[PDB]
Design an enzyme around this catalytic site. Structure first.
Site, mmCIF file in Angstrom:
data_model
loop_
_atom_site.group_PDB
_atom_site.id
_atom_site.type_symbol
_atom_site.label_atom_id
_atom_site.label_comp_id
_atom_site.label_asym_id
_atom_site.label_seq_id
_atom_site.Cartn_x
_atom_site.Cartn_y
_atom_site.Cartn_z
ATOM 1 N N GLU A 162 -3.734 -11.060 70.163
ATOM 2 C CA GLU A 162 -3.283 -11.409 68.988
ATOM 3 C C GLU A 162 -1.466 -11.171 68.892
ATOM 4 O O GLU A 162 -0.795 -11.900 67.902
ATOM 5 C CB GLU A 162 -3.834 -10.465 67.663
ATOM 6 C CG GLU A 162 -5.154 -10.562 67.676
ATOM 7 C CD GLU A 162 -5.672 -11.987 66.744
ATOM 8 O OE1 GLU A 162 -5.214 -12.929 67.421
ATOM 9 O OE2 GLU A 162 -5.933 -12.010 65.795
ATOM 10 N N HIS A 214 -19.187 -22.286 62.952
ATOM 11 C CA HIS A 214 -18.193 -23.388 62.859
ATOM 12 C C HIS A 214 -18.588 -24.524 62.124
ATOM 13 O O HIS A 214 -17.812 -25.346 61.577
ATOM 14 C CB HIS A 214 -17.826 -23.627 64.291
ATOM 15 C CG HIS A 214 -17.243 -22.683 64.942
ATOM 16 N ND1 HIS A 214 -17.938 -21.292 65.345
ATOM 17 C CD2 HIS A 214 -15.866 -22.315 65.326
ATOM 18 C CE1 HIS A 214 -16.894 -20.521 66.094
ATOM 19 N NE2 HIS A 214 -15.784 -21.093 66.199
#
Lengths: 198, 588
Positions: free
Chosen positions: B350, B480
């Protein structure tokens, strides 16, 4: 002398003249222009740079012989949630001149149709708000920039600088200077008095 | 006057007001993540309502400005995502019908209980750790016979609504709408039409196929002892024996497949306890890593606004791994910092995502995003892959210069990454390609389940353990698909992960395979990476890719050089099993 070694300003730079030679140099008019801007737009304030600030707001000459004083003011006039106390004009239908204050408050006409003051199509609002918040980055913090202009004319300047005065020693044949007169001799005591204006 | 001159004035008016409204919608969401209350929820909805109302007014006025009247090759790329109408491009009668299906598919998928049992990690641990045929099969058949049946009428109407919605914005179908992100519509010469995306992906996937055949044959021969009457060496593999409900994560299958049990793997958990990390650290170590590469230092507000601690169970928090971008120089990362091994590699993943946001800091709000949906995630994958090298973690603080390593140690590292990086690669190539034929019109409405099982045995190699019919539906039950997220972005993430790694390891005076490359004390390899990050969306992805790799088209050769020692060992080992998989085979 106390403004250079103050150890409290974020950016203290001078242009044209030296920062150590203007302490005793005489100046006729000493201007003071203060304005609060962003943190990234400080680089535009320089004698030789343009942008959306030095063209439609505060314009400075290219041969500016002075100093640029700017310090950090994040813990002063800055609140969390959005700053709505400072405005700035984005575009204008003309180009301002150096050392001139913006007085006309009109609407920028981008097209060929008149706006008549009301905001509409092809009539964007130039006065926008800043974003002085303590949670933003470095380029979004407010910095109180103070520009001191030095201009000399033919009038006798009354603003010079203090002179370092030493001590007084006698009983010797040394050199001394008592306001203009520079004599070399032994300073002895006298009994006569002069006039209270000579 | 001038159409191009008035176009830049309209952008400056929108950028000065978009950063203020977007920051209020992101600041209110950060307060809810730190402390879960019932007040911060209303603050985000009120701030988000002003953003959706102001964006619609600016999109209507932008239709009067012609798109062809742009010569700077920058305003045209910004007005493409501004003049869009969204899901409300159709009539007012069909507007609420499309948004209703998005809420019905997300509610059933979230409340999908098997009686009881939750979703994640409810059915994920059952399909992984079980080692039984009469246990994990009941959990997989019940999900397709209950959740897929309720989502069958909603999946049929989802294709007809998205087809007309995509054609309203000058496109072809739903799958073609996702092709416009990779299409070059700015600088001439380096163009990339939508028709080129159909090819290349189909050509590079054939060269990587021999690598997957040697990997699929080794797992099938390893799990043969656990299922002697169910897994044949010349047959195939069922749909429930993949360690996942949908066959996406194959990392759980590594526990039952150990090529070398005499060589322990690396572990940096005990090294952090010896040196005593304050639990507020990790980021301090992660900071000096990007300095030696040559990427600029982080900001100052990151160490004073982003919560880098772990409050625990005494404070309500949802520290999910998601990089936030509030804007205006503010960068915050929401993550509970613990003293474990997975958190050491997750924080580095991240950190590369927030580094991309710091590149285009001086750019306007319309240029605060990656070049495409499959490029922003690839920036963080090359940072975690370079930091996961056992040789790189030895020449620093943690680990022991006393831990021995050889060629046998690298085998266990390449096999573990092969079940996550390239493990889901054939699944992405089949799932996205199957939907393109349905959204366009190449598959009839009564041949969805028929063509589904045919493409499985020809790309991935998955048979059906239960003979399904037509009312069933499998791709509808997905995180998704129910959230209306594109899945093609994960395909380019895998290919671009090795292309960027090979470019940095080549200029850093290092040749051979890429399983031991160390990015340290290489200024040349760090300044080249910042070239395409500072531009952002001002330049097309085809031009930015040449500045790092050297070509405008994706390549599969760097994906094979990384798994070169793994492919060599599988050649002199899979001689007793069949290389590949059979199509005419069924476990029942």
């Amino acid at each position: 002398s106390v403004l250079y070694n103050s150890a409290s300003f974020s950016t203290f730079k001078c242009y044209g003249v030296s920062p150590t030679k203007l302490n005793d140099l005489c100046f006729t008019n000493v201007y003071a222009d203060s304005f609060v801007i962003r943190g990234d737009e400080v680089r535009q304030i320089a004698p030789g740079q343009t942008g959306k600030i030095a063209d439609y707001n505060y314009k400075l000459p290219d041969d500016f012989t002075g100093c640029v004083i700017a310090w950090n003011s994040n813990n002063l006039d800055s609140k969390v949630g959005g700053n709505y106390n400072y405005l700035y004009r984005l575009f204008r239908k003309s180009n301002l001149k150096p050392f001139e204050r913006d007085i006309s408050t009109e609407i920028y006409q981008a097209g060929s149709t008149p706006c008549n003051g009301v905001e509409g199509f092809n009539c964007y609002f130039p006065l926008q708000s800043y974003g002085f918040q303590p949670t933003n980055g470095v380029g979004y913090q407010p910095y109180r920039v103070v520009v001191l202009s030095f201009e000399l004319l033919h009038a006798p300047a009354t603003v010079c600088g203090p002179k370092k005065s030493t001590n007084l020693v006698k009983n010797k044949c040394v050199n001394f200077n008592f306001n203009g007169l520079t004599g070399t001799g032994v300073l002895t005591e006298s009994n006569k008095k002069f006039l209270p204006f000579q | 006057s001038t159409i191009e001159e008035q176009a830049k004035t309209f952008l400056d008016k929108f950028n000065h007001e978009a950063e203020d409204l977007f920051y209020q919608s992101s600041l209110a969401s950060w307060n809810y993540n730190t402390n879960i209350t019932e007040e911060n929820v209303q603050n985000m909805n009120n701030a988000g309502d002003k953003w959706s109302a102001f964006l619609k007014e600016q999109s209507t006025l932008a239709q009067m400005y012609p798109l062809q009247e742009i010569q700077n090759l920058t305003v045209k790329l910004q007005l493409q995502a501004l003049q869009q109408n969204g899901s409300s491009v159709l009539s007012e009668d069909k507007s609420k019908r499309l948004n209703t299906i998005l809420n019905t598919m997300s509610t059933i998928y979230s409340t999908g209980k098997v009686c009881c049992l939750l979703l994640e990690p409810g059915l994920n641990e059952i399909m992984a750790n079980s080692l039984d045929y009469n246990e994990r099969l009941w959990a997989w058949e019940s999900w397709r016979s209950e959740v897929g049946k309720q989502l069958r009428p909603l999946y049929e109407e989802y294709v007809v609504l998205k087809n007309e919605m995509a054609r309203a914005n000058h496109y072809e179908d739903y799958g073609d709408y996702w092709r416009g992100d990779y299409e070059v519509n700015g600088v001439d010469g380096y163009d990339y039409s939508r028709g080129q995306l159909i090819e290349d992906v189909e050509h590079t996937f054939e060269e990587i196929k021999p690598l997957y055949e040697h990997l699929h044959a080794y797992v099938r021969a390893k799990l043969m002892n656990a299922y002697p009457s169910y897994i044949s060496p010349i047959g195939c593999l069922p749909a429930h024996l993949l360690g996942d409900m949908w066959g996406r994560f194959w990392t759980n299958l590594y526990s039952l497949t150990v090529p070398f049990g005499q060589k322990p793997n690396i572990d940096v958990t005990d090294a952090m306890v010896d040196q005593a990390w304050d639990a507020q650290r990790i980021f301090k170590e992660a900071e000096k890593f990007f300095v030696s590469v040559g990427l600029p230092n982080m900001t100052q507000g990151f160490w004073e606004n982003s919560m880098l601690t772990d409050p625990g169970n005494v404070q309500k928090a949802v520290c999910h791994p998601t990089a936030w971008d509030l804007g205006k120089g503010d960068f915050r990362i929401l993550m509970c910092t613990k003293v474990t091994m997975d958190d050491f590699l997750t924080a580095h993943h991240e950190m590369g995502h927030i580094q991309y946001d710091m590149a285009y800091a001086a750019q306007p709000f319309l240029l605060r995003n990656g070049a495409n949906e499959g490029f922003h995630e690839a920036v963080g994958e090359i940072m975690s892959l370079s930091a996961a090298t056992p040789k790189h973690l030895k020449s620093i603080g943690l680990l022991s210069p006393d831990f021995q390593e050889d060629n046998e140690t690298e085998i266990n590292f390449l096999l573990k990454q092969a079940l996550t990086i390239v493990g889901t690669l054939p699944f992405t190539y089949m799932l996205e390609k199957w939907r393109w034929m349905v959204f366009k019109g190449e598959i009839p409405k009564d041949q969805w389940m028929k063509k589904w099982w045919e493409m499985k045995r020809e790309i991935v190699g998955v048979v059906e353990p239960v003979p399904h019919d037509e009312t069933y539906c499998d791709p509808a039950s997905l995180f998704h698909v129910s959230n209306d997220y594109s899945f093609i972005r994960y395909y380019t993430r895998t290919l671009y992960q090795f292309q960027f790694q090979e470019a940095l390891c080549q200029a850093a005076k290092h040749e051979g395979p890429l399983h031991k490359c160390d990015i340290s004390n290489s200024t040349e390899a760090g300044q080249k990476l910042f070239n395409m990050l500072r531009l952002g969306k001002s330049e097309p992805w085809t031009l930015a890719l040449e500045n790092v790799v050297g070509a405008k088209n994706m390549n599969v050769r760097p994906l094979l050089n990384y798994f070169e020692p793994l492919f060599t060992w599988l050649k002199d080992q899979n001689k007793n099993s069949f290389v590949g998989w059979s199509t005419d085979w069924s476990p029942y």
